[PDB]
Amino acid sequence: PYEPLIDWFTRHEEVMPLTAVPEPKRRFVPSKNEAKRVMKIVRAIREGRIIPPKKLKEMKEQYDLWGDSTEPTNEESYNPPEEYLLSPEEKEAWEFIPQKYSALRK
Amino acid sequence: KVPPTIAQFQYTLDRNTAAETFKLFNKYRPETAAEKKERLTKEAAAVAASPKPYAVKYGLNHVVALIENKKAKLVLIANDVDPIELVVFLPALCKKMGVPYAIVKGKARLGTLVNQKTSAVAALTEVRDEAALAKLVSTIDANFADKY
Amino acid sequence: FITRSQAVRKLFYYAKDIQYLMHKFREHKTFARKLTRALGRGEVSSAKRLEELDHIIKERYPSFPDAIRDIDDALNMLFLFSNLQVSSKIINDAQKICNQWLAYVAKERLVRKVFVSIKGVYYQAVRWLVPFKFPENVDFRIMLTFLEFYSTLLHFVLYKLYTDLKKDKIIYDSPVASLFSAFVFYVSREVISEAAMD
Amino acid sequence: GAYKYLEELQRKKQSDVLRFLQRVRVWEYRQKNVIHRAARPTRPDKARRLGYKAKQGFVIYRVRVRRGRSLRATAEERVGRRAANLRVLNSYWVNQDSTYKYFEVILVDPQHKAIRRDARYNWICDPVHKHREARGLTATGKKSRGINKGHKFNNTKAGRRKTWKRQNTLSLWRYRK
Amino acid sequence: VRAESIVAKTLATSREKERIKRVSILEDKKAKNETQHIASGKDFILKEKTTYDGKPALLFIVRVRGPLAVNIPNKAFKILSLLRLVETVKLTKNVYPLLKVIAPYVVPSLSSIRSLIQKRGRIIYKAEPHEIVLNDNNIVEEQLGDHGIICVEDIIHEIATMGESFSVCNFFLVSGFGSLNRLRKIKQREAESNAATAPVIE
RNA sequence: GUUUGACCUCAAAUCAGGUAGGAGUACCCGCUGAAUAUCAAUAAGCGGAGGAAAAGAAACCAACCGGGAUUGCCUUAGUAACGCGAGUGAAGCGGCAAAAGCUCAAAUUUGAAAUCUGGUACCUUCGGUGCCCGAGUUGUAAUUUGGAGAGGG
RNA sequence: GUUCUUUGUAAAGUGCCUUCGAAGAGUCGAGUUGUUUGGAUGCAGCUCUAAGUGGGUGGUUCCAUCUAAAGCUAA
RNA sequence: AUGGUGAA
């Protein structure tokens, strides 16, 4: 059904391009559309309706929202009395505790 | 089992060479709308001599205009174009013109590198890096045309 | 009465005071998909271009004195974060806020009571607590939101208080103010500080 | 341009490639509603030469009509009735088989500001163009009406009923001739 | 795995090995003071260019984790193992020749030093590998108090100062995934990015 | 990757901006349509518009020393032609009324998708501007519609 | 008439020289079946389906005239 | 004949 097809035409490379209308000058010259856009932006800047990006960087750069309106520890010291410190036997039943230390640094 | 002119797709560039081609093409990404707009605004502010820009060619009509002029050196063709007739003849046209062509899976993937949601084809005419382009063309030829 | 889960889904509570409360967090979700699209496109310029609670504070605290109700927890969280997947910038901001608050307190010397404890050095102005300058050995997302809200509140609080640099590289009304006045203290390694000698 | 290649390829309708494309597309459409919105035309050259443009305001619809009031006229009438807010401009054949014939119709929405401000397409916004297919003003309708120049359309050059009325009237002037 | 990875690894290793070899040869020739076949007989350090004074200055060390393509050589492996800097002394004349070798793999004030010491807080303690936190100052007194260190603050002061705990303590002491975290990493890559005779880069 | 993204397709929202039915109907357009030739492309029925509608600038009329958008009137003419029977029945040329030509498909803007819809803040508000969003490359603008036309000097 | 603006190496036209120079396919057409015409034309289901110095309309070797298969436009 | 009305 789908028999192979012979490349009787593509087997020979096209020696020469088929097209015409030799190269326009615009291809060897900077685009006129770019110049038109640049001049339009220049006109806009002159009219003061466009801010240059350098000025935008500078522009890229706290209030009383209320004003006048009509609308504890548990003796866990580092050097507590020995009575506060829980006994070792009661520490098993405790499963923060006040503890005795020499000073603030220890 | 389909006519030979069909099923020329589903045979595509391998993963490694496809990735290399995508990496090469990403260098010549055309200036997106935001980049072009900001550059033009900067130029206007400066005004208020130029080198020719380099970018990939992706428009199907524009690419076909470049194709058959022998200017195109390497063309990428998407294999999932819904109107298949738009691309059935492109490989044959490239073969007749002697322009190397590579079928890459995914029109969305092809368009992702040209700032467009989808792109049927992509072609390169100018280069920055000519040795890399020549090596890629030779690899693509040896891996696709001589095999399939 | 509408259940908490049902009310949250629609948006135990009184329906009268909740139905009217249904009126940028939701809109911010679009930024994630825009960033994913930019990543898929393979160009970062669009991502950079895309990249480039006062209202709730007033209703919760219509007046400055009302802030004192939650200032306890606010200062607790701020001081806990000042010494603590929280970003380093958040920690730095929390530390700066606490340092500014302490500097303002010292300027007015509005302190009445203090108590050194195992949990930390307690203070009273309002009571607040700060932990020791040692490393601290839960879902931090709740903690992050609480920190953000408390920092936003404390920003306005500090602005109101203030309305009414090589050191960075080194760092009458009550008996507290009446006593120790002009008593310039010298503090050893454990006013002039010996640590600055380093 | 590539459109010339597309036209040349479409000229050989009975080619094995176009046969495969048609039999695939008809089967694909057989699983869809009789009338449904088309994302894009399957014959870009035909639509482009028929005046279709890829801009906001244009709509492409595919409609299936029973084989055996022409089939194109029936398709245009159906799409106009369904697309009451859109104006049918032209349509073209896209597929056929032993049971059904498929045509694609392009529609322009006059409400869209793009069409309203389009100097080359705002003409369709005039109320006189409402339901062009209803009055047979479309390409298929005009062809079925026999509107053309030459002896082959003398009896139907412009209006088959109008000529009958003209030749049946009795013109009487104030002063009899 | 594809051969490209191993090829790149080998090329980078060879290049960096040659770079280290030239640095070692230059240092060895400089040690002899025979400034007749070397580009620069003196030493430099880059912040701008700064002369490498002979004073044993002490500065913090940071890990750059790369170049990744460069498999770490044996000399660099040993240097990092001795300094335990593999995981991601002082600037003396005898330490510079070894620090320069690991220069591509690596890079203060009281405010930064104190915070770093009081936040990291590694303390080797007995399981045996415990290094959790600066739990209590009494731990330092027990393990290190014999050297005149009554608390971690003494260690901090002696590190800031030219003391002995600076040396003794050596025996005692964007990062996410997901789409949102990719842009920040890509931006930081610009800041993330070496001649043998060139000054050390800080 | 015992994952994360590009699209394409398909659904939904008391979403934002829009349009459609129907009425009237003398005239207009299309379909259908009776009481093998005749009443007849009539009567009746259905669908679609406006102040007019349709048509309109020839794959025309003519066989001349040629005319040159469409439409209406007189004339052509009760002629040619047909059903050669009762009967049906044109059209060019000629004179008059009024006259206007144009727009796409088609060959590269590729040295710059230069195009356009919508949101936002202003102003001189049947619209214009700065910014953003989206459509567009499976083609949006200019350049050409055979009277040729296009790149250059 | 009155008043402010233009501009931007911006857009067109005239004569000359030069290099190029696209054209609506299930469409035309034939066959058959229903339909209209006083026209034998046209309309309409369906098998097939055309070419580019090509195609359509008319007569004694052909000569005369246009370029259909898209659309807009007051009187 | 055309279009409708009610009626098993």
Curated annotation (Swiss-Prot), chain A:
Transmembrane segments: none annotated. Disulfide bonds: none annotated. It is found in: Nucleus, Nucleolus; Nucleus, Nucleoplasm. Residues 27-106 are annotated as: Required for interaction with NOP7. Present with 2680 molecules/cell in log phase SD medium. Component of the NOP7 complex, composed of ERB1, NOP7 and YTM1. The complex is held together by ERB1, which interacts with NOP7 via its N-terminal domain and with YTM1 via a high-affinity interaction between the seven-bladed beta-propeller domains of the 2 proteins. The NOP7 complex associates with the 66S pre-ribosome. Also interacts with NOG1. Component of the NOP7 complex, which is required for maturation of the 25S and 5.8S ribosomal RNAs and formation of the 60S ribosome. Belongs to the WD repeat BOP1/ERB1 family. This is Ribosome biogenesis protein ERB1. The lineage of its organism: Eukaryota, Fungi, Dikarya, Ascomycota, Saccharomycotina. The gene is ERB1. The chain holds residues 239 to 376 of 807 of the full protein.
From Swiss-Prot, chain B:
GO terms for cellular component: cytosol; cytosolic large ribosomal subunit. It is found in: Cytoplasm. Keywords: Cytoplasm, Ribonucleoprotein, Ribosomal protein. It comes from the Eukaryota. GO terms for biological process: cytoplasmic translation; maturation of LSU-rRNA. The keyword 4Fe-4S does not apply. GO terms for molecular function: RNA binding; structural constituent of ribosome. The keyword Cytoplasm applies. Present with 238000 molecules/cell in log phase SD medium. Component of the large ribosomal subunit (LSU). Mature yeast ribosomes consist of a small (40S) and a large (60S) subunit. The 40S small subunit contains 1 molecule of ribosomal RNA (18S rRNA) and 33 different proteins (encoded by 57 genes). The large 60S subunit contains 3 rRNA molecules (25S, 5.8S and 5S rRNA) and 46 different proteins (encoded by 81 genes). Belongs to the eukaryotic ribosomal protein eL8 family. Component of the ribosome, a large ribonucleoprotein complex responsible for the synthesis of proteins in the cell. The small ribosomal subunit (SSU) binds messenger RNAs (mRNAs) and translates the encoded message by selecting cognate aminoacyl-transfer RNA (tRNA) molecules. The large subunit (LSU) contains the ribosomal catalytic site termed the peptidyl transferase center (PTC), which catalyzes the formation of peptide bonds, thereby polymerizing the amino acids delivered by tRNAs into a polypeptide chain. This is Large ribosomal subunit protein eL8A.
From Swiss-Prot, chain D:
GO terms for molecular function: RNA binding; structural constituent of ribosome. Residues 142-158 have a biased composition (Basic residues). Residues 137-158 are annotated as: Disordered. PROSITE patterns: RIBOSOMAL_L15E (PS01194). GO terms for cellular component: cytosol; cytosolic large ribosomal subunit. Coiled coil: none annotated. Component of the ribosome, a large ribonucleoprotein complex responsible for the synthesis of proteins in the cell. The small ribosomal subunit (SSU) binds messenger RNAs (mRNAs) and translates the encoded message by selecting cognate aminoacyl-transfer RNA (tRNA) molecules. The large subunit (LSU) contains the ribosomal catalytic site termed the peptidyl transferase center (PTC), which catalyzes the formation of peptide bonds, thereby polymerizing the amino acids delivered by tRNAs into a polypeptide chain. There are 2 genes for eL15 in yeast. Belongs to the eukaryotic ribosomal protein eL15 family. This is Large ribosomal subunit protein eL15A. It comes from Saccharomyces cerevisiae (strain ATCC 204508 / S288c) (Baker's yeast).
UniProtKB/Swiss-Prot annotation, chain E:
The keyword Calcium does not apply. GO terms for biological process: exonucleolytic trimming to generate mature 5'-end of 5.8S rRNA from tricistronic rRNA transcript (SSU-rRNA, 5.8S rRNA, LSU-rRNA); maturation of LSU-rRNA from tricistronic rRNA transcript (SSU-rRNA, 5.8S rRNA, LSU-rRNA); ribosomal large subunit biogenesis. The modification Phosphoserine is found at S175. It is found in: Nucleus, Nucleolus. Keywords: Acetylation, Nucleus, Phosphoprotein, Ribosome biogenesis, RNA-binding. The keyword Transit peptide does not apply. One of its GO terms (cellular component) is preribosome, large subunit precursor. One of its GO terms (molecular function) is structural constituent of ribosome. Coiled coil: none annotated. Involved in the biogenesis of the 60S ribosomal subunit. May act as a specificity factor that binds precursor rRNAs and tethers the enzymes that carry out the early 5' to 3' exonucleolytic reactions that generate the mature rRNAs. Present with 7720 molecules/cell in log phase SD medium. Belongs to the universal ribosomal protein uL30 family. This is Ribosome biogenesis protein RLP7. It comes from Saccharomyces cerevisiae (strain ATCC 204508 / S288c) (Baker's yeast). The lineage of its organism: Eukaryota, Fungi, Dikarya, Ascomycota, Saccharomycotina. The gene is RLP7.
